[PDB]
Amino acid sequence: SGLVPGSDIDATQLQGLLNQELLDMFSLDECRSLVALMELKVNGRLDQEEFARLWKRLVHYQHVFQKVQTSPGVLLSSDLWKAIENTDFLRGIFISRELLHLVTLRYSDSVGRVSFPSLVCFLMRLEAMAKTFRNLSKDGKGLYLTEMEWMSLVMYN
Amino acid sequence: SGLVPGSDIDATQLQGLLNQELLDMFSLDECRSLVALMELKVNGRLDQEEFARLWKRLVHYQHVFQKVQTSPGVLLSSDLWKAIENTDFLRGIFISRELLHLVTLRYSDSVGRVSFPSLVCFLMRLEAMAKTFRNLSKDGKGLYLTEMEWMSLVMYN
Ligand SMILES: [Ca+2]
Ligand SMILES: [Ca+2]
Numbered sequence: 001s002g003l004v005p006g007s008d009i010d011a012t013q014l015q016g017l018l019n020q021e022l023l024d025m026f027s028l029d030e031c032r033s034l035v036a037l038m039e040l041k042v043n044g045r046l047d048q049e050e051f052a053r054l055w056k057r058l059v060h061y062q063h064v065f066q067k068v069q070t071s072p073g074v075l076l077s078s079d080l081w082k083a084i085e086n087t088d089f090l091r092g093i094f095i096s097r098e099l100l101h102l103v104t105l106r107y108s109d110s111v112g113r114v115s116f117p118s119l120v121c122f123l124m125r126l127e128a129m130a131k132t133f134r135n136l137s138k139d140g141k142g143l144y145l146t147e148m149e150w151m152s153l154v155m156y157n
Numbered sequence: 158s159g160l161v162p163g164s165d166i167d168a169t170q171l172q173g174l175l176n177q178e179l180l181d182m183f184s185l186d187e188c189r190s191l192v193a194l195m196e197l198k199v200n201g202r203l204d205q206e207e208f209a210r211l212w213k214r215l216v217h218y219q220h221v222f223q224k225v226q227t228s229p230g231v232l233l234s235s236d237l238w239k240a241i242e243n244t245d246f247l248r249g250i251f252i253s254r255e256l257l258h259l260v261t262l263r264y265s266d267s268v269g270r271v272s273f274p275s276l277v278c279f280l281m282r283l284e285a286m287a288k289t290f291r292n293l294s295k296d297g298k299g300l301y302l303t304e305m306e307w308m309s310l311v312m313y314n
Pocket of ligand 2: 196197198199200201202203204207
């Protein structure tokens with residue numbers, strides 16, 4: 001259990017596992033986002049391959065949070081740039097100062113702390129969204145999307 | 158309090174308010190999404206105008222959930238189409254069968270129920286994302302975005 005030997009794990013199961021193993025808790029909604037970001041065969045659950053992908057990232061994020069935190073479980077908003085730098089999955093991704101500011105507002109609590117579940121969500125989403133662009137763009141400058149393409153990319157994540 | 162008379166409400170305050178007034182609870186992360194979707198002056202809090210915008214929607218969603226639910230607090234996944242139909246803010250938005258399927262996977266729990274906080278998130282996000290497209294598209298068929306435009310739209314929400 002929480003090993004995914006040819007079996008699957010859904011968001012509800014994933015939540016119980018992450019909260020028991022890693023921990024500020026992961027919400028069920030966040031786990032549904034994690035499933036959405038990591039699915040290859042889209043069916044609302046993670047097979048062994050998809051789970052391995054998620055797990056490798058989670059292990060990595062644990063290390064990054066441990067390295068960057070000011071104290072056990074406390075990562076400061078002003079150190080979020082260091083979390084990005086320490087996340088190899090983001091290689092080649094450069095965000096603007098303004099975008100960093102927006103993500104800081106979105107992922108940090110009211111006293112300038114970023115929880116582990118919040119950091120996980122942010123780093124996985126940043127990677128997914130940056131890779132979508134880089135992979136779909138024909139010139140690396142812009143992206144053209146159909147309505148249906150746009151809506152699917154922005155709604156299932 | 159929870160009235161926002163020239164004052165502001167942040168996501169943490171918003172969470173306490175929504176959970177006390179409406180309720181399955183809103184997570185803090187969901188409240189940060191709600192703030193992001195409703196901001197006009199982007200600073201991580203809702204001023205009186207932004208809060209009014211959020212509140213009008215929330216009142217509407219309450220009515221829709223009450224109308225469509227199978228029993229107190231139980232909205233079935235298979236009835237999500239009826240929630241969309243009953244939400245005037247979505248007027249002019251048509252989603253595909255496939256997109257409906259994806260959102261069902263993303264917003265429903267493991268037994269085919271959609272919680273009130275999940276419905277709120279879904280209906281607000283659908284509206285925001287559809288309006289972005291409709292408003293940015295020059296022909297109503299496609300959208301061209303710069304990298305920076307793409308990343309900002311997909312990360313702050
Ligand atoms: Ca799958
Ligand atoms: Ca504001």
